[PDB]
Each structure stands twice: as structure tokens, then as C-alpha cells.
Amino acid sequence: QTNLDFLLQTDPTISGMMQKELQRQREHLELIASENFTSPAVMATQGSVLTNKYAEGLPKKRYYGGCEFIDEIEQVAIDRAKELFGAASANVQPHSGAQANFAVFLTLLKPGDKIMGMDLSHGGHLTHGSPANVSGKWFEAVHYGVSQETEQLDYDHILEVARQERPKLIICGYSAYPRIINFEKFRAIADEVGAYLLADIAHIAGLVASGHHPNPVPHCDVVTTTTHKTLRGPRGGLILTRDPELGKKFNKSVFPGTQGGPLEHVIAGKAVAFGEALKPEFKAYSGQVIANAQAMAQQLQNRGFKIVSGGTDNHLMLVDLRSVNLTGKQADQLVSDVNITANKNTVPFDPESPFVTSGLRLGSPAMTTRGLGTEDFAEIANIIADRLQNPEDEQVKQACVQRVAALCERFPLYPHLN
Amino acid sequence: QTNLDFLLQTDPTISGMMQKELQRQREHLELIASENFTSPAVMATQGSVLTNKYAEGLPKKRYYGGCEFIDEIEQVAIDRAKELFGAASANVQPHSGAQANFAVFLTLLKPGDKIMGMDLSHGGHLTHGSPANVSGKWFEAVHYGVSQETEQLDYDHILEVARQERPKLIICGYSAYPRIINFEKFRAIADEVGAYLLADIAHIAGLVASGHHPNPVPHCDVVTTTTHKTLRGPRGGLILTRDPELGKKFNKSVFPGTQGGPLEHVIAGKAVAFGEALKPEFKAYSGQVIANAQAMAQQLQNRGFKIVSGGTDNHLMLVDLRSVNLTGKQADQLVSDVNITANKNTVPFDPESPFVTSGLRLGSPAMTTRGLGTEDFAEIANIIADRLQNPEDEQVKQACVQRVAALCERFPLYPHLN
Numbered sequence: 147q148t149n150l151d152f153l154l155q156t157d158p159t160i161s162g163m164m165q166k167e168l169q170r171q172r173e174h175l176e177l178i179a180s181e182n183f184t185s186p187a188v189m190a191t192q193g194s195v196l197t198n199k200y201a202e203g204l205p206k207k208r209y210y211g212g213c214e215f216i217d218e219i220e221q222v223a224i225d226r227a228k229e230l231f232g233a234a235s236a237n238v239q240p241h242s243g244a245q246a247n248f249a250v251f252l253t254l255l256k257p258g259d260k261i262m263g264m265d266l267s268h269g270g271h272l273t274h275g276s277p278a279n280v281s282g283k284w285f286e287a288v289h290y291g292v293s294q295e296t297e298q299l300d301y302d303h304i305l306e307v308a309r310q311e312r313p314k315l316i317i318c319g320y321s322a323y324p325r326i327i328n329f330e331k332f333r334a335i336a337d338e339v340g341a342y343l344l345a346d347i348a349h350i351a352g353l354v355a356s357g358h359h360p361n362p363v364p365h366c367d368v369v370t371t372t373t374h375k376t377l378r379g380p381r382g383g384l385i386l387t388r389d390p391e392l393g394k395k396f397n398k399s400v401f402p403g404t405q406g407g408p409l410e411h412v413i414a415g416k417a418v419a420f421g422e423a424l425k426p427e428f429k430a431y432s433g434q435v436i437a438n439a440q441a442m443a444q445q446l447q448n449r450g451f452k453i454v455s456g457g458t459d460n461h462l463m464l465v466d467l468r469s470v471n472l473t474g475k476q477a478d479q480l481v482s483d484v485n486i487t488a489n490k491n492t493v494p495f496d497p498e499s500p501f502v503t504s505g506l507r508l509g510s511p512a513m514t515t516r517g518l519g520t521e522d523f524a525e526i527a528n529i530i531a532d533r534l535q536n537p538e539d540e541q542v543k544q545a546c547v548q549r550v551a552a553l554c555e556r557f558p559l560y561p562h563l564n
Numbered sequence: 565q566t567n568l569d570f571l572l573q574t575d576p577t578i579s580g581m582m583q584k585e586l587q588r589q590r591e592h593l594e595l596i597a598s599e600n601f602t603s604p605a606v607m608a609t610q611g612s613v614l615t616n617k618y619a620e621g622l623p624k625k626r627y628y629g630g631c632e633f634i635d636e637i638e639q640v641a642i643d644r645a646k647e648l649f650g651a652a653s654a655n656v657q658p659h660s661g662a663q664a665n666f667a668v669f670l671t672l673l674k675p676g677d678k679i680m681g682m683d684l685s686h687g688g689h690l691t692h693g694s695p696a697n698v699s700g701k702w703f704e705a706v707h708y709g710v711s712q713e714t715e716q717l718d719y720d721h722i723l724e725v726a727r728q729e730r731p732k733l734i735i736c737g738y739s740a741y742p743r744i745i746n747f748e749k750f751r752a753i754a755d756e757v758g759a760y761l762l763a764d765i766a767h768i769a770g771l772v773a774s775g776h777h778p779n780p781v782p783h784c785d786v787v788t789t790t791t792h793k794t795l796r797g798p799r800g801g802l803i804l805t806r807d808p809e810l811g812k813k814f815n816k817s818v819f820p821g822t823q824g825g826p827l828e829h830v831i832a833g834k835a836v837a838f839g840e841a842l843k844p845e846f847k848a849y850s851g852q853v854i855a856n857a858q859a860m861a862q863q864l865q866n867r868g869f870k871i872v873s874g875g876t877d878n879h880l881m882l883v884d885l886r887s888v889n890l891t892g893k894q895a896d897q898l899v900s901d902v903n904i905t906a907n908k909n910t911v912p913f914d915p916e917s918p919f920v921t922s923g924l925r926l927g928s929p930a931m932t933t934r935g936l937g938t939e940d941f942a943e944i945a946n947i948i949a950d951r952l953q954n955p956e957d958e959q960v961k962q963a964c965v966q967r968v969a970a971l972c973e974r975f976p977l978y979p980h981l982n
């Protein structure tokens with residue numbers, strides 16, 4: 147008798163909906179740039195009895211009895227994070243990227259202090275100063291964007307904004323930026339205006355880990371990330387720093403500053419995911435992720451689409467939809483209609499509201515995990531192009547649905563499960 | 565081939581430490597009052613592919629494609645929460661109790677506003693105004709305590725403190741309070757000083773759900789809880805309110821106010837746990853939890869120990885350790901030494917610091933889940949009494965270890981697993 151057998155017996159409603167979600171993951175092209183398919187091993191840790199343990203504090207410094215094994219697991223997670231990212235300090239307890247970022251803010255700032263991040267419409271995150279997020283509600287958020295000419299960062303301009311605004315904290319790292327970030331230049335800029343420097347590498351963490359993107363850790367005061375995007379782990383957050391005394395302060399801000407008990411089953415999954423990312427296979431995967439994203443971006447360009455910045459250095463791209471006279475909201479719907487899962491996104495200098503947008507964000511990590519190569523991603527580009535160019539055409543619609551089905555059949559997902 | 569097989573094959577280190585943690589849970593008396601043993605069904609949801617989905621927003625109002633099944637699951641969680649607690653609104657996304665409470669604060673307060681909760685040393689939570697927590701760092705926290713005479717709440721005195729202090733938010737609900745809370749009197753007090761009223765029922769949520777403790781939902785502005793203590797679910801948080809317009813505001817404060825993507829695998833587990841708590845078996849379990857706690861408290865009293873307040877109405881108790889000339893820190897260690905897992909706790913008006921304390925907190929939920937009855941809890945009381953009364957006696961130590969082993973053998977934990 148298995149845990150899944152108990153679920154079927156005791157909650158057939160939830161059991162059935164879970165089976166539908168597995169079918170759904172199998173039978174769609176998952177192109178949301180922040181998604182991935184985590185391993186069977188990771189999922190086993192999340193399904194474990196580790197959920198039952200209260201473990202406030204840190205390994206060997208807990209507020210409860212009985213943490214001897216939890217301490218061993220969390221210490222493996224910490225040690226593998228420090229190995230993977232070349233970091234002197236790591237806190238593996240943040241429940242999410244949002245909570246990792248909040249703990250950093252609690253450490254470095256007081257309410258009302260000024261933060262400077264990327265414009266949300268240009269690729270910055272809600273937690274980097276959106277007025278609907280605590281980061282913009284309780285702090286004074288100012289923004290930099292990309293160049294209207296190159297559609298990428300102009301470091302001279304960023305320095306000019308920093309000098310004018312005098313932020314206490316500068317944030318780099320983004321949700322929708324397709325080029326390499328120069329952390330050395332961010333350090334120069336922070337040093338010049340006396341700001342703290344945070345790199346939020348949630349999206350690119352697996353590329354950092356694999357050596358396919360420069361590492362912010364030696365240069366920044368602190369680095370946050372999620373564990374579940376290109377790092378292909380469970381959902382959760384992570385705080386890294388080159389400064390182990392500062393790391394002690396961040397620990398206090400995670401607990402007792404912002405969280406209670408950590409999710410030790412998730413932390414076991416973080417350990418597992420970090421161990422997988424230490425393997426040579428993961429370096430190859432991460433190279434393939436970028437090759438695949440570039441292939442999809444190039445083929446979209448071949449089909450007449452504008453890619454913001456003219457291409458990509460990483461796992462993602464923004465498709466500007468003027469060439470096809472669609473809003474992001476419309477394009478997102480139209481691709482959902484042919485079993486492609488993405489999300490809309492504002493482009494730099496978007497004429498439309500964020501609830502409408504002019505862009506579609508696409509990424510390669512999830513389908514790269516299923517085994518697709520560059521020519522398979524060129525085929526994905528062609529399916530998307532076909533659908534967006536001929537949105538009223540029913541025969542194109544069904545061709546797209548059939549081409550998606552072929553890709554999904556070729557590249558099974560979790561074939562041992564039902 | 566199973567997910568656990570993949571874990572063993574790919575990460576024997578983590579696999580082995582996980583197996584040790586299962587053995588540990590089996591072979592200790594787990595008396596931490598905030599712990600439980602969640603079901604195989606719940607653990608199956610946590611181990612599922614639902615970890616792979618980004619689902620910012622709410623059911624049918626998401627910021628990503630592909631949430632059709634996630635929406636069905638989260639809507640089941642919501643509907644079962646509203647059923648179980650008789651609530652007009654529920655948000656099942658908070659990652660933790662701390663995050664549920666923070667989202668409420670973001671909705672109702674601004675930094676600097678005054679909050680009033682139970683003194684931490686008297687049983688209040690870190691998130692109810694500790695100076696080491698955001699709740700006391702960024703808000704003005706004032707406290708009420710219990711009567712030095714009765715060691716329980718004196719509602720006239722609470723009204724006097726509220727009138728003097730004029731808090732914007734009053735918090736009731738506690739981490740270490742062993743008596744019934746009168747939510748009607750808290751409403752009277754809040755109405756009289758024009759304060760919002762939050763009930764944080766994390767500890768007692770399963771007793772509320774089963775009708776063995778009065779329900780705060782009809783009386784309070786908002787109710788927070790965790791899902792993992794007496795509710796016996798996965799680790800996470802929950803926001804309930806009688807006011808569905810207010811509920812919409814709390815939703816915005818969870819996302820995008822304080823969190824990003826929800827943990828949909830955990831949310832599936834919340835649905836399952838709520839479904840289990842709707843069953844008559846859970847009513848019986850919750851009655852047994854209180855009978856068992858009372859049995860342990862009574863037998864400790866028979867062995868000469870002071871129980872704060874003179875007994876318990878719920879799942880927990882605080883043992884005052886003056887009768888045995890020990891600190892909480894010492895008592896906690898001494899019981900760990902005989903395979904009993906608890907935690908130290910300050911008593912009301914404790915002469916010692918919170919890092920030392922004069923108290924041991926004990927609770928019945930976890931061992932009640934394993935099947936123990938009242939006479940078994942009287943035996944637990946006798947083992948603890950023996951150890952604390954004779955801390956230097958090696959023969960008593962081994963008798964205690966052997967008596968713990970007998971209890972654990974009689975009442976197997978998750979016997980289908982290895």
C-alpha cells in the first residue's frame with residue numbers, strides 16, 4: 147500500500163484532478179519561462195514525512211527537540227548551495243523568492259527607504275518596487291529601464307539615475323530580461339552612490355550554476371533566487387552572500403524576522419536539486435536551454451516577429467506582437483487554444499496597459515527538460531507563428547494542435563507515473 | 565519504478581537521512597504541541613507534479629496559462645475551508661502562518677501603527693509584536709498577559725489596556741494558552757476602542773473545526789491559521805473571514821502584496837486535510853486530543869507538578885518546573901535524553917530569560933494521531949515525572965527509555981512505509 151493508494155481511497159476528487167494535471171503537463175507545450183519539470187527524486191522528498199517536523203532556528207541551533215536528521219538534511223542543502231554558487235553563506239529556508247527578497251529588505255532597509263530596480267514593464271519583478279507589492283507600498287521605489295535604442299541595459303544611464311535618486315538598495319536581476327547582466331558594472335554603480343547591491347537571479351539561477359551566465363555572488367552584497375525555474379528544483383527561495391557575517395544577519399531576518407518554521411521536506415528537495423545541478427549533465431542541459439531559446443527566437447525572427455533586444459543570451463525571450471496586430475492577452479489566448487502554455491508580458495515602452503500588453507514571453511527550460519533540441523524549438527516557433535499569423539483560420543488551428551501532439555508524443559514526461 | 569526509487573538511485577545521502585527521520589518519528593514520543601502526523605494522502609499531494617505549476621492570481625483569474633486543473637484543486641481547498649470553518653471567504657495560498665498574518669497586517673495597517681497581542685512570554689506568537697519579528701520591528705506592539713492570580717485571561721483587564729493603548733489591531737489566539745478563548749468578549753473590547761480584531765487560531769484550528777472550541781469566524785474581522793498543527797494538514801497558512809469584500813482585500817495582500825506563486829501541491833494537501841477534518845472520525849480524534857492532554861496534565865499534577873492555569877481546555881499545557889528545581893532548557897534536554905521530544909517555554913511571570921525559561925510545553929495531537937488513549941497519556945506523564953524528579957539516576961533514565969519504546973511499539977506510525 148502506497149501514499150497514492152491512500153489518496154485514491156480517501157479523496158477520489160483530488161486524486162482525479164491530480165491525474166488530470168499530469169495529463170495536462172504531458173499534452174501541452176509548457177513555454178512559461180519561469181516553469182520547469184522537477185525530478186522524481188525532488189518530488190519524493192516533497193512527499194516525505196519531513197513535512198511533520200517543526201525546526202525553527204538553524205542546524206544545531208534549533209528552538210525544538212528532535213531535529214538531528216533535519217539538521218543533517220538542511221546542512222546538506224546549505225553545503226551544496228555554497229558549492230554550486232561559490233558562496234560563503236547560504237540560507238535555504240525562504241519559502242519563496244518573494245520571502246527571500248523580503249528577508250533581505252528587513253535586514254538592509256527600514257520602511258520609507260529608497261530602492262532602485264528595473265521598471266516592472268521593462269522586466270523587473272513585483273518584489274522590486276511595484277506599488278501593489280509591499281516593496282513599493284512601504285518603500286520608495288524608483289526604476290531604471292532599458293535603452294529605447296538597443297532594448298538592453300545602458301550602464302551609463304543606470305549610473306545617472308542612481309546618482310540622481312541616491313537609492314539605499316539597488317536591485318538587478320529580472321523576470322523578463324533576455325541579455326547577460328554585468329554584475330561588475332552594478333558593483334561599480336553601487337559603490338559610486340554608496341548603495342547596497344542585491345542580485346535577484348531567480349530566472350537565471352541554473353545558468354549561473356552551470357557557468358553559462360556570470361555569477362553575481364563575488365560582486366554583490368547579497369544574491370536571492372528561487373529554486374524552481376532554471377534551477378529545476380522544488381518551489382522555494384534561497385539567500386546567498388559572499389559575506390558570512392552579513393549571512394548571519396539574513397538568517398535572523400528569515401527566522402524570526404519574517405518566517406516561522408521552515409518547510410523541511412521542500413529543503414530536502416532543494417538539497418536534491420542542488421546535487422543534480424552539480425552534475426556535468428546539468429551543465430549540458432543548461433547549454434541546451436540557451437541553444438533552444440536562441441533557436442526559437444531566430445525562427446520567430448525568420449517568420450517576421452520582433453524579439454525584444456534582437457535575440458536572447460539566456461532561457462527566455464519577449465515576442466513583440468505588432469507584426470501580427472495582436473495584444474499579449476490575445477496572443478496568450480490564441481496559443482492556449484492550440485495547447486501551448488505561455489504568458490503575456492509588457493514590452494519595453496509598451497503602448498498598452500499591463501493587463502493587455504504588446505508581448506508574449508516564451509522560455510525553453512521546461513521543454514528542454516523533456517529532451518527537445520534546437521530543430522524541435524524551431525518547429526515550436528513555426529507552430530506559434532502559424533497560429534498568430536492566421537488567428538481566424540480553423541485549418542491552421544488544427545494543424546497547430548496536431549503538431550503540438552506530435553512533439554508531446556515524441557518526448558514523454560514522467561513516463562513511470564500514473 | 566517509483567519516485568522514491570529515483571531518489572535512492574540518484575541521492576543515497578538524502579535518501580538515507582530521510583529514512584533516519586522516519587525511524588526517528590517512529591521511535592520518540594512527539595509531544596511538541598504544534599506537531600502532528602499528517603496522512604499518507606496529504607503526503608501524496610505534496611509529492612505530486614503540482615509542484616511544477618506557476619499559478620499567480622486566483623481560480624479563473626490567473627496571470628498564466630494552463631491553470632484549469634490547479635483552479636479546480638484550489639477551489640476545492642477554498643470550498644472545503646469555507647465549509648469546515650463556516651467562513652464566507654477563504655484564501656488557501658499563504659505559505660505559512662507567518663505569511664498569513666503578514667498579509668493581514670499589509671491589508672489593515674501601515675508601518676508604525678499600534679498592535680496589541682498576548683505577551684510573548686505569556687503565550688503570544690513572534691508574529692504578534694516580537695521586537696525580533698517584522699510585527700514588532702515595523703509596528704508599535706503593546707501586549708496583554710494573563711492574570712497573576714488565575715493565570716488566564718482577565719477580559720476586564722484586557723479592556724483597560726485597550727482603552728489606555730488605543731491599538732489599531734487587537735490579536736487573540738496564542739502559541740501556549742491552555743484555556744478557551746472568548747471571542748465574543750474580544751469583539752466587545754475591539755468595538756469599544758474601534759480596533760480591528762484578528763484571531764490567530766493556528767494551534768487550536770482542528771478543535772475549532774471539530775466544534776471542541778468556539779469558532780472565532782462569526783465574531784472577528786479575520787481569522788488566520790496554519791494547516792499543520794491540530795488541523796493535521798500540510799505545513800502552510802490560511803486566511804478566513806466572515807466579510808467577503810474584506811476577503812477580496814486579503815487576497816490582494818497575499819498576491820501580489822506579499823507572495824508570488826502559490827505552492828499548489830501544498831494547496832492540494834490542504835484540500836485533502838480539510839476533507840479529512842469534515843469526517844466524523846476527526847470530531848472523535850479532536851475530542852480524544854483534549855481528553856489525552858487533560859489526562860497528561862492531571863497525572864503530572866498527581867506527581868506534584870504545577871500546570872499553568874491549573875489544567876487545560878485544549879491540546880496543550882505548560883509545566884512549571886519549580887517543583888523539580890529545573891529550567892525549561894534543562895527539562896527539555898532531560899526528556900530528549902529519554903526519547904521524548906518537546907520544547908521549553910517561558911511561563912507567565914517567568915523569572916528566567918526566554919533562552920532559559922521555567923517551563924516545558926507539552927501537547928497531545930501527534931501521539932493521539934498514533935492511537936494513544938488517556939491511560940497511555942497518564943503513562944507518558946509518569947515517564948516525564950520520573951525523569952525530571954530523578955535527573956541524575958541512570959536506572960530511572962533506562963526505565964524511561966524502555967517505557968517510551970513500549971509505547972512506540974504499541975502504536976506504529978505509517979506502518980506501510982520504508
Ligand SMILES: Cc1ncc(COP(=O)(O)O)c(CN[C@@H](CO)C(=O)O)c1O
Pocket residue numbers: 200202405406407598659660661662663689691737738739764765766767790800801
Ligand atoms: C499562533 C501562531 N501563529 C502563527 C504561527 C506561525 O506558523 P508558521 O510556522 O507556519 O509560520 C505559529 C507557529 N507556532 C510555533 C512557533 O512558531 C509553535 O511551535 O508554537 C503560532 O503558534
Ligand SMILES: Cc1ncc(COP(=O)(O)O)c(CN[C@@H](CO)C(=O)O)c1O
Pocket residue numbers: 180241242243244245271273319320321346347348349372382383618620823824825
Ligand atoms: C526575479 C524574480 N524574483 C522573485 C520571484 C518570486 O518568486 P516566488 O514566486 O517564488 O515568490 C520571481 C517570480 N517570477 C514569476 C512572476 O512572479 C515569473 O513567472 O516570472 C522572479 O521572476
